[PDB]
Structures are given as structure tokens and as C-alpha cells.
């Protein structure tokens, strides 16, 4: 075994090691603290021990597990709250008589007290099998199987025996696979290392919408399933609000929520909040939560957990992605993950890169966003799946030019900016067209056009109204509004309405917070019809003040529209929006003449 040579900080050095990878999992002492071997210097391997320490004797045994840090992929992880080092928090509440994990402790990663229902597959006796094949399924949800159990990758052979339908335990073996003698027996759960991305047959171009549920996101620059998103903070971001939205509204089969070393209050809000809210298609077994599995970490909880959080979460996502399930993976917040690398780089003593943030931040980050995307499922059956990675980031430099933000901006596909002034007025989440993009919009808009919406034309008209508004707004502040004409006076006004009404999605309703793809379309259409009619009316002889005065009541009605539920008319396409079109047209005749 090992002998502990030095304990200096969270970095611990032990002599008389052997084996040792570079991601090998070790348990330090009899306390059994979480660590990982970072380096080797001589016979002595340098391990950062990321668990808290106030009472670790130097000269105790260090035990190798013999293998890299991994997560267990199998049934019963759903509807379960874990940390990134994989210990059931729920179990930790019972045992420990403490909600968070106490140091000096370690316990198994999956409850081994429950039995699960195995139903046969599509692989009977003598069918050939190769990893990601659906061997059977275990029901976990009351409408779907959330866990379809696969043979682990890099396993193959022909199945001598499939155990029959029935209830079994997850410790219990139910399969024998033949490759080169008796290969092994298999259980319901299998391991996979988190530092190895799970294979895939082939990747597919993204083409199927992520319904974000939010107007301001659909309207300004839409995202796609298979997407990548970067959001910059400054603590006016409203990350929990939009994350909570993403969990409920996104139509993904599974959602993996990842707490990357957070407040500990916010992760607690989203756990409690899911059973109170309802699913988007009926079902109760703690509704939203039944499709949601949580990684929850707190800021001064073990750093291994925090670091492992995005990797463990994304591996969870990849498993469901090979099962052929669509997954929305919400990483909140990766800049605290990047911070951990700053810390690591400091403790070791190695020199950093730009502003003390290491150079290995860009490459590691780039691998991560690349493991997400839309794909064709691993194995013989062939299914389609998705991983949509949505990641919040923050400065710590008081600018947007800092390494963390910059390295994500390089790589990211969709960017939703943050404008501090709007957020100061409150407009969660807050964006302008000049600070945000989606490269995906073009291909998305053709898809939306098929669906019903007038979506393409509305995307070009939306950008254009905001872009003109920005230029004119400088001229108004400094010079005066005296130079401007009445049509451009209108440009500011229609644009203001869009700021208050779209961006603001904090609400006190779930109608002021959920805006369906159809609800988002009607609103945008109604507002552009106004602007076009408005520029004409002043053009053939009418004033900005006079026009404003005549619509008057009808303008209030479009502002307040957002509060109204979407479940009426045809579906979310209300008669309330359709009648409004006629009243604009009528108003146009009055305004002009």
C-alpha cells in the first residue's frame, strides 16, 4: 500500500506507490477521503485530496481502487439527488442525521436496498450483441422507461442466457454473455469512467427545436436540440429562474440538472419546486422530478465533486442519448468549475496562463461542449438522441474580456448576452441583438415555417427593429430627439414595448413565464404589423404623438397580453390575438386621415 509522506494543504503526497494513472481514484487514510492522482514525482504520487481535512494523520494507508474515477450507469439514478462523487444525498440524510455530507465518510453510490422490474428486450438467446444494445428496460417513470439498460461499450459476444421476465435486484445477475470463454456475468448497473466520453455510431446534424418555453429566447435567437449555449453573468443574470424554466418547459425526455458548486439555496429551490409544478403531458410520481435527476453541490463542499459535476452530468446525458432519449443538460455554473482549475494550478505551484487562469481551461472546455449534440444512438437497434448543453459562466474581472468568458465564447454556438442596464431595470433574461447570436437560426426558421409560424420573416424584422433603435438612442441622448423624425421616434417606442414585454419573464404566473412557440409567434406578428402601419401612417400625414394617442387603449391591451394564459382559441393561438389584427388595421385608417 501507500504511506502518507506529506499533507500540505488539500495536496497530499504519498510514497510507496505503484500503478497509479493520472485519473486513478484513491482513498487516502482510514478516513477514506476522495482524491485523485494528479502527478507522480519519483516513486511518490501526488494526490490532491479534495474533501475537507482537519485531522488526517501522516503515515496512514492509501488504498487504490485500481481504476479511474467513474459513475455507475443503470436503474434508479433517476429521481435521486447526488453529489459529483456519487453518494446518494437522500441516504446521507437518513444515516448521518445531517443533510450535507460529513468528511471522513464514504458510502456506496446507488441504494442497494430496492428491487427493479426487468422486462425482456429485443435480444433473445443466440442473438448477437455489441455495446449500447437494449438488453431490457426498467420502468422508473409512469409513462416511459427512463432507464433502458444497455450492455456497457466494448463488450460484445452472443448471449447464452437471458433470465425471464420478473423482478430482480440490481445487485443480482441476470445475464451471461459469451466472448472468449465465460466473459463475465452482468448486472443491471455497469460502470463507466467520466473522463472517457461514451462512444457513438454517428453524429447527426441538429434540426429539431429546443423549446426553451421563453419568448425572449425563441424570438431573438432560437436554440436547437443538439445546441451549445453560453450565458455571461454579473449577478443580474437570473440563472436559477431560467434554469427552472429549462427543466419544466423543455420537451426533452430527460433533464440532468447539474449544480457545479452553487449557493446551496438555489439547488434546494429547484428540487422543491419540481413536485409542486406539473408535467407538460400529465403524470405524477413527483412530476417534473420524475424526469429530473440532480447533481447538487455547494461551494465549500468537496472540490472533487464540483470538478466532477459537469463530467458526471454529461456522461449521465450520454447514456440516455445512446438509449435514444432526448436530453437537456443544464450546467450551472461552469465558471465555478473553471475557478476550480485556477485553484488547482495554484495549490500545485505550476505557472498559470492569462490572469492566473490555466491554459488547459480552453482545451478541457472544448472537449466538454463537443460530447453534446444530436446523434444517432450507439448499438445495433439505431435510435435518435440529443444532448443540449446550456452553460452559465460569470466574470470575476468586472469585464467580459476575462479568460473564462472568452474561452467559452470561442467555442459556443449560441450566445445570450447580458446587458446590465436592462437587468437593473429588471428584464430577466436581458438581451439586445448586438450582444447575442445563434448561428443555428437559419436552419431553425425553415423548420418553424413548416410548423405554421411566419417565423423567418419575423426573425429578420425583430433584429432590424432592435438594431435601428440602438443607433438612434445615442443620437437622442447627446444631441436631442429634435434631429430625428417621427418614424424613427416610433422605432424607439415599439422597441421599448418589446423590452418590457419579452425580456421580462420572472412573472408571478406560469403564463408570464411560459410562452409556447405559437404564443411567441402571435405576439411578434402583432407588434411588427403595428410598426409597419405606424411608419406609413405618419408618412402619408400623421404625428408620433397623435398616433400614440389614438391607439392608446389598444396599446395597453398588447402589453397586458402576456399575462393571459396560453390554452385558449385553437391551442395558444387565441382569438384574442386574431381580433387584435383587425383593430390595428382599423386604427390605421383613423391615424392617417
Amino acid at each position: 500500500y501507500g504511506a502518507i509522506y506529506s499533507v500540505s494543504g488539500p495536496v497530499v503526497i504519498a510514497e510507496n506507490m505503484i500503478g497509479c494513472a493520472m485519473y486513478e481514484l484513491v482513498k487516502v487514510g482510514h478516513d477514506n477521503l476522495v482524491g485523485e492522482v494528479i502527478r507522480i514525482d519519483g516513486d511518490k504520487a501526488t494526490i490532491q485530496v479534495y474533501e475537507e481535512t482537519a485531522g488526517l494523520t501522516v503515515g496512514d494507508p492509501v488504498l487504490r481502487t485500481g481504476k479511474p474515477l467513474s459513475v455507475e450507469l443503470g436503474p434508479g439514478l433517476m429521481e435521486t439527488i447526488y453529489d459529483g462523487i456519487q453518494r446518494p444525498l437522500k441516504a446521507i440524510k437518513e444515516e448521518s442525521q445531517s443533510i450535507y455530507i460529513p468528511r471522513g465518510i464514504d458510502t456506496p453510490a446507488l441504494d442497494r436496498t430496492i428491487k427493479w422490474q426487468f422486462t425482456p428486450g429485443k435480444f433473445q438467446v443466440g442473438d448477437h450483441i455489441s455495446g449500447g444494445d437494449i438488453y431490457g428496460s426498467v420502468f422508473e417513470n409512469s409513462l416511459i422507461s427512463s432507464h433502458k439498460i444497455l450492455l456497457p461499450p466494448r463488450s460484445r459476444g452472443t448471449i447464452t442466457w437471458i433470465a425471464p421476465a420478473g423482478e430482480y435486484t440490481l445487485d443480482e445477475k441476470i445475464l451471461e454473455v459469451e466472448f472468449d470463454g465465460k466473459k463475465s456475468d452482468f448486472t443491471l448497473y455497469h460502470t463507466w469512467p467520466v473522463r472517457v466520453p461514451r462512444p457513438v455510431t454517428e453524429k447527426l446534424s441538429a434540426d429539431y427545436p429546443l423549446l426553451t418555453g421563453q419568448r425572449v429566447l425563441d424570438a431573438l435567437f432560437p436554440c436547437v436540440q443538439g445546441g451549445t449555449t453560453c450565458i455571461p453573468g454579473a449577478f443580474g443574470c437570473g440563472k436559477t429562474v431560467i434554469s427552472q424554466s429549462l427543466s419544466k418547459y423543455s420537451n426533452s425526455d430527460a433533464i440532468i440538472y447539474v449544480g457545479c458548486g452553487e449557493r446551496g439555496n438555489e439547488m434546494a429551490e429547484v428540487l422543491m419546486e419540481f413536485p409542486e409544478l406539473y408535467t407538460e403531458m400529465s403524470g405524477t410520481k413527483e412530476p417534473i422530478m420524475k424526469r429530473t435527476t440532480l447533481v447538487a453541490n455547494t461551494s465549500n463542499m468537496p472540490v472533487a465533486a464540483r470538478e466532477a459535476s459537469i463530467y458526471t452530468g454529461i456522461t449521465l446525458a450520454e447514456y440516455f442519448r445512446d438509449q435514444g432519449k432526448n436530453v437537456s443538460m443544464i450546467a450551472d455554473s461552469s465558471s465555478r468549475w473553471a475557478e476550480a482549475l485556477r485553484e488547482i494550478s495554484g495549490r500545485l505551484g505550476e505557472m498559470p496562463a492569462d490572469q492566473g487562469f490555466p491554459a488547459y481551461l480552453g482545451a478541457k472546455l472544448a472537449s466538454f461542449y463537443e460530447r453534446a449534440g444530436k446523434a444517432v444512438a450507439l448499438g445495433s437497434p439505431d435510435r435518435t438522441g440529443s444532448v443540449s448543453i446550456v452553460a452559465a459562466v460569470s466574470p470575476a474581472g468586472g469585464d467580459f474580456s476575462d479568460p473564462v468568458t472568452t474561452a467559452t465564447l470561442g467555442i459556443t454556438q449560441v450566445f445570450w448576452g447580458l446587458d446590465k442596464k436592462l437587468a437593473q431595470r429588471k428584464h430577466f433574461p436581458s438581451i439586445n441583438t448586438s450582444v447575442s447570436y445563434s448561428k443555428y437560426t437559419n436552419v431553425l426558421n425553415k423548420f418553424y415555417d413548416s410548423n405554421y409560424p411566419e417565423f423567418p420573416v419575423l426573425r429578420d424584422r425583430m433584429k432590424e427593429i432592435l438594431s435601428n433603435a440602438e443607433e438612434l438612442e445615442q443620437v437622442v441622448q447627446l444631441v436631442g430627439k429634435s434631429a430625428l423624425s417621427d418614424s424613427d421616434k416610433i422605432t424607439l417606442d415599439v422597441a421599448t414595448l418589446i423590452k418590457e414585454d419579452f425580456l421580462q419573464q420572472n412573472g408571478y404566473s406560469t403564463y408570464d413565464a411560459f410562452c409556447p412557440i405559437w404564443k411567441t409567434f402571435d405576439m411578434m406578428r402583432a407588434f411588427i404589423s403595428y410598426h409597419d402601419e405606424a411608419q406609413k401612417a405618419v408618412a402619408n400625414g400623421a404625428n408620433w404623438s397623435k398616433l400614440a394617442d389614438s391607439t392608446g387603449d389598444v396599446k395597453h391591451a398588447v402589453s397586458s397580453s402576456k399575462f393571459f394564459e396560453p390554452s385558449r382559441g385553437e391551442k395558444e393561438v387565441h382569438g384574442e390575438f386574431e381580433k387584435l389584427l383587425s383593430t390595428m388595421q382599423e386604427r390605421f385608417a383613423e391615424s392617417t386621415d
Partner: protein
């Protein structure tokens, strides 16, 4: 063995490898003084220690060690209420001897049974400026962000004297159900500032329900970092045993950060950006985790830390890390102070993440939140419109804009101006807001639903 060297506040000890991590050792000086220290680093037959007492004057073979064999723990007791301490737990004004009923190690993680159910009750100090715009829940953390040239001390004082008068009123509404205690930790502050805080607790009659920990800047930098932590270990004990809402006031954060920085440029770790620590985040995180409801679910730890920017910016490494961890900030501004507005707390970028959660309907209106949304918007636009008025004159200033100019003045001189003995209540704040907001037309007031608007203009 004995001391090989000292490089700054690090002491190089040569001693054997048998001690544990954070094991206390004692240094026998030939000066008739004993000094305590705790192992920061353990290495092959040597250790590197930070001493709580002194920072210099450490010898070679004149100086010897004996290891205590006991890791650093605080004797946390609950009958610690009304007793006065310093920054190590010795009495400086002859408060009662520490004793012991439990010992908890300091690691920011005692027993850690912090939140997995969020706070939802409301605490009011009677300050509208604070309460309305920032709805403080029973285990949220909202710091006070101020800057130099401000009376941040005075506002911290407003909270402390007015708390423990408002709270029994709130007890009936079902905002509270249980007693309040204040645990005040001062770090790195002047004698004059320290007395002020003590004066405020005497003056009210809450000297028996408060714990006061006083650390001064002329006490070691190592003593200073232990001071917030010591306060926090105690705080968790009171919450656990006697089920009270504990408010912690941790002042000043910059002083604490200066201490961490000296122990990171004198470390063999290279520090982060602007010579401020690379694990500076972590050091701050240790305080912050220790927030929320504690088991038996009727005690809690609620946090208001006090930050003064020593460089007048939110650009600086201290505000930016601080703000990410906490859930909001309460902002104070310079302009308002200069003019004669007290408290000078500005409401322009002050924000509460867990505002929704904090407001209820069994001790607050549901219209607290709706009306908040209007005030934040209106004030924000109004402040910006005023600066704009200066530039343009009246040639790009509308009738509607004139109304925003009036709302701004009135908000400043009424909502924000209240003396340091003036106590409000939530219902009154809403009523006064409603009136100011009233001059605006129905059309203008658009971020609040017609149902609400019509009933209360």
C-alpha cells in the same frame, strides 16, 4: 525538534511526521511567552505553521516545541449569549469563561445540515429601502455593498438596534414565531468603530441576546481570519439547540481579504488576478455555505456581511467574487449620502434573487412582489432620464418624463429618507409606494396585471 527558520508568518518547524492535520502545537519561547500555532503544512520531518499570536520574534534553538496532540476546535456553547469575546475567544471586558458543552472543528463544515428546503418567511428591520426592494428571507444572504466615503458602519448599526423591536410585531403576522439573536463579528476595525457596535447593543437592551467578537487590525493577520469562522461555529450551535434565527453581521470583508492575500503572496502558491489569492473564492465560500435552516427546522442562520470597496469599483476582485456567491446585494451610493439622505442606500442595482420565495401571503401581501417590480423599473428608468434631462433640456423631455422626474424626487426624499429610530412595516411601505406610483396612467403601468392595478391605483 526545534525551529529551523521563519519566513514571514510561516514558521518552518522541524518536527516529526506523527501530528495530524490542523493539530495544535505550542512554541516555547525563551521570553516567558507561549504561542500557539496550527499546522498549515506537514512535510517529511518538518511542518510549516501559522501562529495565531505574534508574527515575528521566532528564534532557532532557543525556541523549542511540544505538540498538544489536539486538533483545532471551538468549545461552542449556547450559554454564550451576553458574553463578550475578542478574536480568539478570550475575554477582553471580563465576560464569562468559555467552558464547553460540545466541541466543533472549523472547516466551514461542522456537521453541515444546511438547506435543501429554501427560506420563505420574512424578516423586516422596518427599513423600506431595504425590505421592499430586497425581500430578505430567513436564511438568504444579501451583503451590503458600499464604498469609501460612506457610513456603512451606521447602516449596519441601524439594522442591529432596529432588529429586536420589529421582530415581535412580525411574530404575530407569522413572519416570525421565535426569538432573534444577533451574533456580531467585527474584523479588522478601529477601537472607535468597535465601541459603536457595542454601544448599539447596550442602548437597545439586546446585550444579553448578542455575542460580540472584536478583532482589531493590530491583532495578527492569522487571528483575523479565524474571527469570522469562530463566530459562525457558535452561530450554528445557537440555531441548533434553542431554535432561534440568528443574523450574522460580518464586517468588514475587505479586511479579511487583505489577510488572505498576505498569506498567499508569502505562500508557495502563486496568487490569482490583481495579486489577490487564487483560492480567494474558496476562502470566502467557507463563510457562505453556512447559511439556511438548521435541523428541527425553526432555527436558521441568515447573513448580511458588510463590504466597503477600498478602490471604489465593482471591477475589483472582492465585489465580483462576493456577489456571485451571495443571492443579491444591497447597494449603497455616494451621491445619496452627500445630499443629506440617510440611510443612503440606493435602489438602482440592488437586487434579490430569492425575492419571490421570500414574499408570502400569510405574513406579507402577494402585491409586495408586484409592486416591487414597478419600483425597480420606474426608479431605474427615472434616474437615467434625469441625467438625460441635464444634457437635452426640455427638447427631448416629454410630459410623461416630467412625471418620472417627480417620482424620482419623491422616492429619494421619503422612501429612502427615514431616521435611525424610525420603524416601518411592510403594509405602510406598500401604501406609500402605491400613492407615488398613482400619477402614472394605466397604460404606463404595464408590468403589473389589470386585476391588481384597478383595485389599487
Amino acid at each position: 525538534n526545534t525551529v529551523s527558520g521563519v519566513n514571514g508568518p510561516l514558521v518552518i518547524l522541524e518536527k516529526v511526521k506523527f501530528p495530524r492535520y490542523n493539530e495544535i502545537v505550542n512554541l516555547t519561547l525563551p521570553d516567558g511567552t507561549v504561542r500557539q500555532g496550527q499546522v498549515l503544512e506537514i512535510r517529511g520531518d518538518r511542518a510549516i505553521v501559522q501562529v495565531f499570536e505574534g508574527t515575528s520574534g521566532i528564534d532557532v534553538k532557543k525556541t523549542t516545541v511540544e505538540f498538544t496532540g489536539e486538533s483545532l476546535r471551538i468549545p461552542v456553547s449556547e450559554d454564550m449569549l451576553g458574553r463578550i469575546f475578542d478574536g480568539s475567544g478570550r475575554p477582553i471586558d471580563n465576560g464569562p469563561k468559555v467552558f464547553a458543552e460540545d466541541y466543533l472543528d472549523i472547516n466551514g463544515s461542522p456537521i453541515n445540515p444546511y438547506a435543501r428546503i429554501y427560506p420563505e418567511e420574512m424578516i423586516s428591520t422596518g427599513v423600506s429601502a431595504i425590505d421592499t426592494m430586497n425581500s430578505i428571507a430567513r436564511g438568504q444572504k444579501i451583503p451590503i455593498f458600499s464604498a469609501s466615503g460612506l457610513p456603512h458602519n451606521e447602516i449596519a448599526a441601524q439594522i442591529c438596534r432596529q432588529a429586536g423591536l420589529v421582530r415581535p410585531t412580525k411574530d404575530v403576522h407569522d413572519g416570525h414565531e421565535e426569538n432573534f439573536s444577533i451574533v456580531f463579528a467585527a474584523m479588522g476595525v478601529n477601537l472607535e468603530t468597535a465601541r459603536f457596535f457595542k454601544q448599539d447593543f447596550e442602548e437597545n437592551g439586546s446585550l444579553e441576546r448578542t455575542s460580540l467578537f472584536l478583532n482589531l487590525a493590530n491583532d495578527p493577520t492569522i487571528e483575523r481570519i479565524i474571527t469570522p469562522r469562530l463566530a459562525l461555529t457558535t452561530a450554528e450551535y445557537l440555531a441548533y439547540q434553542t431554535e432561534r434565527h440568528v443574523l450574522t453581521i460580518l464586517t468588514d470583508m475587505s479586511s479579511y481579504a487583505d489577510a488572505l492575500r498576505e498569506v498567499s503572496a508569502a505562500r508557495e502558491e502563486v496568487p490569482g488576478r490583481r495579486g489577490y489569492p487564487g483560492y480567494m473564492y474558496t476562502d470566502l465560500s467557507t463563510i457562505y455555505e453556512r447559511a439556511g435552516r438548521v435541523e428541527g427546522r425553526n432555527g436558521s442562520i441568515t447573513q448580511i456581511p458588510i463590504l466597503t470597496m477600498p478602490n471604489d469599483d465593482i471591477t475589483h476582485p472582492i465585489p465580483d467574487l462576493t456577489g456571485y456567491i451571495t443571492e443579491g446585494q444591497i447597494f449603497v451610493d455616494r451621491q445619496l449620502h452627500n445630499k443629506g439622505i440617510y440611510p443612503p442606500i440606493n435602489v438602482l442595482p440592488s437586487l434579490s434573487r430569492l425575492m419571490k420565495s421570500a414574499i408570502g401571503e400569510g405574513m406579507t401581501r402577494k402585491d409586495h412582489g408586484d409592486v416591487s417590480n414597478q419600483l425597480y423599473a420606474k426608479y431605474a428608468i427615472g434616474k437615467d432620464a434625469a441625467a438625460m434631462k441635464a444634457v437635452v433640456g426640455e427638447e427631448a423631455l416629454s410630459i410623461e418624463d416630467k412625471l418620472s422626474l417627480e417620482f424620482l424626487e419623491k422616492f429619494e426624499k421619503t422612501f429612502i429618507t427615514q431616521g435611525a429610530y424610525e420603524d416601518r412595516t411592510v403594509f405602510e411601505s406598500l401604501d406609500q409606494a402605491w400613492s407615488l406610483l398613482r400619477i402614472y396612467p394605466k397604460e404606463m403601468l404595464n408590468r403589473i396585471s389589470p386585476k391588481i392595478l384597478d383595485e389599487f391605483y
